[PDB]
């Protein structure tokens, strides 16, 4: 069992061109809620994601056209150090966002009924 | 078919069958390609009542499989994945070719 | 149950025995296949006379496609781009926007004829019977750039086979 | 309804047409454009108006099941007529 | 620019590169690979052809889908050039023929088709015109093939000021006339030369070369009514060119000197061929024709092109020529032949 | 006595009483030198003298190959040369020691 | 932490792996030009495996260095039983893609690419 | 080649004629089918099964069923697994038509290639009838089949089914006893029962290796335990014996067929449950509940609860399997498809020792390889 | 009668438990884990150098004859250390019964060649070299067999983009194929198809 | 139509000299077929 005090780097393994090896920068997140539901499912892995890249009109037909191999590329993580590891192993720049978590919320109904408060309602 | 009855005989002659009783042609014999409206069934959850999807749902009785040994966590018999499978019965209707 | 294709053994009687070197040195098989060959000879032949005639179909056929329209000349289409959804080969570019008169109605309606699979997802998942694969089949073109179809192509086509194609989704529409 | 662009090239229903500039229309040389001349937003306006006297009316498209989904449409604005969105055909309650 | 000639893309078969060019005489050697280059890049590209569309097939592969279109057109019809020049912001015209034929002259494809199919561009609003001619362009020359291109590259400037006149000097390449018909001559027993070859300066110019010149001519914004010269970098005797020629090919070279008016005859027996001919008094005239040396005007480094010296790509053409014995032969077996410089 | 087990490439054995004891013999005699606790020796030795039993009391192959379930006689000296082989790799291999090591934190975990 | 060497131990004898693929490619490329019938000189492909050899010449991982030559040594072994074709040993050398521009000026000039 | 199937580069080392070696070279017809189906929902893989082994197509198509059915934890209605079972059968004799016929032509016959395509046409009819699509049908679906059978369908197969053993007879009446064909077949490509089951073949070859095993019948699926049949063994493990053995499969598989024909229960086709199977148009265009379940299962597709199984079937070409790893989306993790035929490909490399030209072309055709499936 | 529920077995359930805790206990050394899914699957997680030893094991043993390799396959999931996963699938003919055996591995550790206990391992290994990058350390032909010659990635990764880096087309001008950086005229429309509403209370993870 | 010819020659088309503007005496194609007797010649139905 052989000794290594280097840090782990397969770029020259994965057969990923030197200009998406370099000039790519993913991003690090959990996805935001989509506002138009009230689901929170799909805000608890993070996701890896690349910049996006020029998009243009095909001549025929209108269709959008794309030269950037890893537009569709989305990567599932169960942990920011996890997602953070692959891609420094990956050897693509990364930007980390920190996870937003809705903060704690103090609710009751018998506030809508308030005697001297604002919090009294006009309809319901 | 259509043909002379000296052909016919020259035919069953040279395969020794009667061709005329299994006839790789299709005459009149096949469903007319115009049928009547068909009335197909409900099924068995088309009940107006005591049918609650909680007591049919198949999806959501599936469970995480059962975790028979984990590291992390009397003379017993040696067991066998299954009992042996028996040993098979020559066929009946014809056992040889 | 199981049973042995070859295992048997021939019996070693002196009749057998020659029957067999007769078979031998008199090619007793080969003139029975030789006979078999000649009795398909005189057979008829299966062979229809296309273009003059034309191999059975059913209602059910998936050809080329077709945008409908309602019987008072309105396009079925309702720009719900639940075909484009489910289309497995992504053949399907959908647009639309609201119409002059409000209409939820396409724009864009392409099928890339060169990319479907003819696998018949997109009329099983229209809800209003838009989209449907017509029965025809003989539109082999010479150029690649033919065969990608947009909305105007295909109304003509729903147009130049509405009759037939409701024909068959009326002859078919009950096992549906 | 087929509408002429002013470089003589047909205006689909879409209302698409090319340029006089756009190098495009080099395509349609020595070929055609394919334009449908059925115009369903024309169509659906030669249609009638329905009168039922009903506040609520229900549309299927007419043929049942090979029609399109049922809705339920409410004849109560006496200002315009209410109109199934599925297959665009208008509804209205007598009136005078 | 309009909005649908702005480039996009990265320069691939699928991208846009804003070009529209109507590219005469497309079905040949040059037009092939000038078509292969612009389709390429990802343009617009317009075939008028006069031929049969079979012997158009080769062009097809070149593009994207939409982005190669074949229209027929006749040369003597105006109104089908217009056709085919309406919508391409670059006309490249590459019309010409080694011989005459009985409905086409010398005159007709090198003075009134490149005239016709300048001043129709120049109506039709073209905004670039690439014309090519011949580096031995001479009004004065023995030959009616370069006399004619003389008077058309005249007859081309005056219709349209604005143009680009490209002389290549001699194109060899792997469906040329040059590097094949000087390989070509092992039937006819020995090869036949004026004066043993010793009198004719020669230095020939790559057909990737000339292409890539062409289309860094329509990219470049300074070379819009200019005149290029396109040779080689190295200039060789007709004897050294032929017998490193014969040398690659691995044939016996057997030379000899023939006069010049018993080679014009022999030119003339065989010019009578209804067919394409094997070679002409014109053409003979050429081959004899020692290259002009014009360092006035610019060329291939001028526009951006390292010209690729014979010796790299000499073996891409004479390797068909080679029997069995010599097939594997590799191309650095060969010594280079003695240039004059 | 038969002539042919029905399998190709798997010959009749004329002696297979005496192949069979000599072969669990062995297995059994390899089986001494695992240790004493390991639970590979116990539960194969089990089987062994199970199946060596059956073959010391059962002199016809028919009934003997009814009893032992494990196909034909053939076939049961195949997996006790089998069993012999297996018998000698795990004496050099040692599986009954403790776990080489267990799994990084989240390595099985599933979906994730 | 301790791994488990695929080869080579240490980075010396990977680099003894390197020098032994690297002449067996440097003696193959006379026999790849011979065979395939290429219009390359034996210089361009001795320059083009060295080129393939030092773009790989930044790794300090004795594992990595190791799979890098064992994939050369594939694709060695691909070379030499004609199991390819002039059309992948010419794919090495990339004839026909245009240069892509390196300045910021030219950059800026033809796209949006950084 | 004509004998290499399209898409199969064979590279051999031959003395004289004498094969040294055989190195299949593979991939010429590999599309990236497993990534594809990972990029695809539940009902849209379904195509590329059908496109896996284009000779059983119904077959990949129910085996993929019945790995998402047992992920799903749903059940199939038995007019459903009746339909399945007799089009597998009909399948398996487009299949074994094509293997036989196929392999004679390899070996130089063509009289049976032409008159039992034309039975495959018949059979091609039955598949446009069902599903509109003469080979790819997309009918056997996780939760049932798509439609129910037209009214004529049953009286139609009933009459090919009856007028097809004559076919088979005259297909034996010029290979079962012709000289010419035992000299090519027997004892060509011979094949040990351990060396088989080592290098994992599966079907035909096992049972002509003499292995009596028949997936079929130890782990039924469908209702294949309530119909009877016999599976064929050989004895000498040889291209004659699997040529027995695949002719005695299309008669068991007639007996099968007959026996669908008859117990064809009446009932609905798929599983009654709306947010796994879409609803009938009617109850779309009626319904609300039903309107919402046709709009989420078209266009997201039904969620499979996460968990991995292997689940094989006894496709014509042998044991057919699909190992599908679901994550609880309604997009598939993982899926490998392990075709029979990938195993046997490996093999040909040790059935061809001692053999010529002409015999490894024999063996090719005994293996029956479809590289569709070998490649993906 | 739930006739859109698939029925249990508990009768094999127990089976396989049984015998996967018999093998538990008879080789502690390398095996981690024991599962049984709920339709009847018995399925082993054992540590990577063992492989050797647990496919001898169950093939070998007589009660455990697992005598065919049905399949041999990896999964990558980049979310963990070791993100290739390989999976056997082994069938036994005497007892009519399957089994999986699980193991890991990354990218630059090896995983041994089991082709001296299958034979078929040699074509599974090379395509799961082929398409995931993972070594097999004694193996007598280890190469590509899907992707083409001289094709750089492994296809199958997550983090290898759906159409590739490079495409294929005929250039005149060399008179050979050539490749050329990938180009759609259509690019491949990514949908996000995941309801934000948790359909399975059984497998819900805990919040952590 | 002829019941009497096996299925698939039971029924046939004699094609027009002249379609719209071509003349199709020798060039006959299986697309100059109109619809309803398209379906009635590919037997999606029994009724002309
Ligand atoms: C030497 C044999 C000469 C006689 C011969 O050819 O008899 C054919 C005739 C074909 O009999 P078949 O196969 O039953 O007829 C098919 C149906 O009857 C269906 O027949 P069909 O109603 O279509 O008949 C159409 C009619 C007209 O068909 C034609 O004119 C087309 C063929 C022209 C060939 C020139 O065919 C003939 O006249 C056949 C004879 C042509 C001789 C030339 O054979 C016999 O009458 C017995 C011959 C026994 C030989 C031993
Ligand atoms: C003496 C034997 C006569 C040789 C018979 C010729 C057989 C065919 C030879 C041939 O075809 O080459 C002609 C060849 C080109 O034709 P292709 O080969 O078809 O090239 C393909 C074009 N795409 O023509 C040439 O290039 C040679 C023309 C140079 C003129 C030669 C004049 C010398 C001959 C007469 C010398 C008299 C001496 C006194
Ligand atoms: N090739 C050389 O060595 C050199 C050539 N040039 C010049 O470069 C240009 C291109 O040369 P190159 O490619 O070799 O020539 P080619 O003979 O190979 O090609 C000529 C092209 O022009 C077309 N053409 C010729 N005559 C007519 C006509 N009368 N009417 C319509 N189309 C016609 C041909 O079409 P079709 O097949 O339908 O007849 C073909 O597409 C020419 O102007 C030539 O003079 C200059 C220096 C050297
Ligand atoms: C495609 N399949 C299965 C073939 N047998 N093909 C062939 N060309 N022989
Ligand atoms: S038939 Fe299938 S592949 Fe074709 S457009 Fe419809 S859904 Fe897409
Ligand atoms: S499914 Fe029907 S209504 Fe919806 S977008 Fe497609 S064609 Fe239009
Ligand atoms: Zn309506």
Known sequence: LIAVDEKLDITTLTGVPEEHIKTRKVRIFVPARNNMQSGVNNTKKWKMEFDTRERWENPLMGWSSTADPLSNLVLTFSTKEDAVAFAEKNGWSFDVEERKVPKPKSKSYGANFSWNKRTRVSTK | ????????????????????????????????????????????????????????????????????????????????????????ELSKDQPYL | TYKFVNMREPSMDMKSVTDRAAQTLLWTELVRGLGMTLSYLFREPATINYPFEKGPLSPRFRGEHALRRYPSGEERCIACKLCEAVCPAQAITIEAEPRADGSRRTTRYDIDMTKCIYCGFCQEACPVDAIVEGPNFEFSTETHEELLYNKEKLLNNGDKWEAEIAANIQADYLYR | GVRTSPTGEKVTHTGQAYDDGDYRRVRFSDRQKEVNENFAIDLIAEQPVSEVGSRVISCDGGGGALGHPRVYINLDKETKTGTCGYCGLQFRQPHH | LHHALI?????????????????????????????????????????????????????????????????????????????????????????????????????????????????????????????????????????????????????????????????????????????????????????????????????????????????????????????????????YLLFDLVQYIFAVAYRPFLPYPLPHFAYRWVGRLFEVSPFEPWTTRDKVERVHMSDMTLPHLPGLEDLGIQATPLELKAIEVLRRHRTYRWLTSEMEDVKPAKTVN | LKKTTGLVGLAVCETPHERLKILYTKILDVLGQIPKNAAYRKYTEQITNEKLGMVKAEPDVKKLEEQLQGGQIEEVILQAENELSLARKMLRWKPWEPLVEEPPANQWKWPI | TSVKPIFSRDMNEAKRRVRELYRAWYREVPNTVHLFQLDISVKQGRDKVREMFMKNAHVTDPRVVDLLVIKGKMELEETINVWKQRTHIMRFFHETEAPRPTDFLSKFYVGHDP | HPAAHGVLRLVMELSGEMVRKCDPHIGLLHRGTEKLIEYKTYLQALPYFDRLDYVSMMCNEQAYSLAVEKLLNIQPPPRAQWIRVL?????????????????????????????????????????????????????????????????????????????????????????????????????????????????????????????????????????????????????????????????????????????????????????????????????????????????????????????????????????????????????????????????????????????????????????????????? | TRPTIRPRNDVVHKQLSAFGQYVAEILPKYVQQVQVSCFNELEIFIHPDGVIPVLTFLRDHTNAQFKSLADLTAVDVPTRQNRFEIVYNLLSLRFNSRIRVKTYTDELTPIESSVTVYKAANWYEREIWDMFGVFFANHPDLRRILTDYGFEGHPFRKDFPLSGYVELRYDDEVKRVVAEPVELAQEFRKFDLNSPWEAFPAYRQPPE | EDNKQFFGRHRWVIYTTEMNGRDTFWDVDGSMVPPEWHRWLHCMTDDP
């Open chain 2, 1 to 88: 078919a259509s043909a002379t009855r000296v052909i016919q005989l020259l035919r069953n002659w040279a395969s020794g069958r009667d061709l005329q009783a299994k006839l790789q042609l299709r005459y009149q014999e096949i469903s007319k390609r115009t049928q009547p409206p068909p009335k197909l069934p409900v099924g068995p959850s088309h009940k107006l009542s005591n049918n609650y999807y909680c007591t049919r749902d198949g999806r959501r009785e599936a469970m995480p499989p059962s975790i028979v040994m984990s590291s992390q966590k009397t003379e017993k018999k040696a067991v066998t994945p299954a009992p042996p499978i028996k040993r098979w």
């Open chain 5, 7 to 235: 480039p996009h893309g990265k320069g691939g078969r699928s991208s846009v590169s804003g070009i529209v060019a109507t590219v005469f005489g497309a079905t040949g050697f040059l037009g092939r690979y000038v078509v292969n280059h612009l389709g390429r890049m990802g343009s617009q590209v317009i075939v008028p052809y006069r031929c049969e569309p079979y012997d158009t097939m080769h062009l097809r592969p070149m593009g994207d889908l939409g982005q190669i279109i074949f229209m027929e057109w006749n040369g003597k019809d105006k109104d089908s050039i217009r056709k085919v020049v309406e919508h391409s912001n670059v006309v490249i015209n590459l019309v010409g023929r080694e011989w005459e034929t009985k409905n086409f002259d010398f005159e007709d494809v090198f003075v009134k088709i490149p005239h016709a199919i300048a001043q129709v561009s120049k109506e039709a609003g073209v905004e670039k015109l690439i014309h090519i001619s011949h580096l031995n362009a001479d009004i004065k020359s023995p030959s009616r093939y370069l006399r004619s291109k003389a008077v058309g590259e005249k007859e081309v400037r005056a219709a349209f000021p604005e143009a680009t006149i490209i002389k290549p000097s001699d194109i060899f390449g792997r469906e040329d006339r040059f590097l094949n018909y000087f390989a070509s001559m092992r039937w006819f027993g020995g090869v036949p030369l004026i004066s043993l070859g010793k009198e004719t300066v020669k230095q020939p110019v790559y057909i990737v070369d000339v292409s890539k010149g062409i289309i860094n001519a329509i990219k470049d914004p300074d070379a819009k009514g200019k005149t290029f010269a396109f040779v080689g970098p190295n200039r």
């Open chain 8, 87 to 376: 089009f597998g059968e009909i399948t398996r004799l487009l299949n074994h038509i094509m293997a036989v016929t196929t392999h004679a032509l390899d070996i130089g016959a063509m009289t049976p290639f032409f008159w039992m395509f034309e039975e495959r046409e018949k059979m091609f009819e039955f598949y446009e009838r069902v599903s509109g699509a003469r080979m790819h049908a997309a009918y056997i679906r996780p939760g049932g089949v798509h439609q129910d059978l037209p009214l004529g369908l049953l009286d139609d197969i009933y009459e090919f089914s009856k007028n097809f053993s004559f076919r088979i007879d005259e297909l034996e009446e010029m290979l079962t006893n012709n000289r010419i064909w035992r000299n090519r077949t027997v004892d060509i490509g011979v094949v040990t029962a351990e060396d088989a089951l080592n290098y994992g073949f599966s079907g035909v070859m096992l049972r002509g290796s003499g292995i009596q095993w028949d997936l079929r019948k130890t782990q039924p699926y469908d209702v294949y335990d309530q119909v009877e049949f016999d599976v064929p063994i050989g004895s000498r493990g040889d291209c004659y014996d699997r040529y027995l053995c695949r002719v005695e499969e299309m008669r068991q598989s007639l007996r099968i067929i007959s026996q669908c024909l008859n117990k064809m229960p009446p009932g609905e086709i798929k599983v009654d449950d709306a947010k796994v199977s879409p609803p009938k148009r009617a109850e779309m265009k009626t319904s609300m509940e039903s309107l919402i379940h046709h709009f989420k299962l078209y266009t997201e597709g039904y969620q499979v609860p996460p968990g991995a199984t292997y689940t094989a079937i006894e496709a014509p070409k042998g044991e057919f399997g699909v190992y599908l790893v679901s994550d609880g989306s309604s997009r598939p993790y993982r899926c490998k498809i392990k075709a029979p035929g990938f195993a046997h490909l490996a093999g040909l490399d040790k059935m061809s020792k001692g053999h010529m030209l002409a015999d490894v072309v024999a063996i090719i055709g005994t293996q029956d390889i479809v590289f569709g499936e070998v490649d993906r």
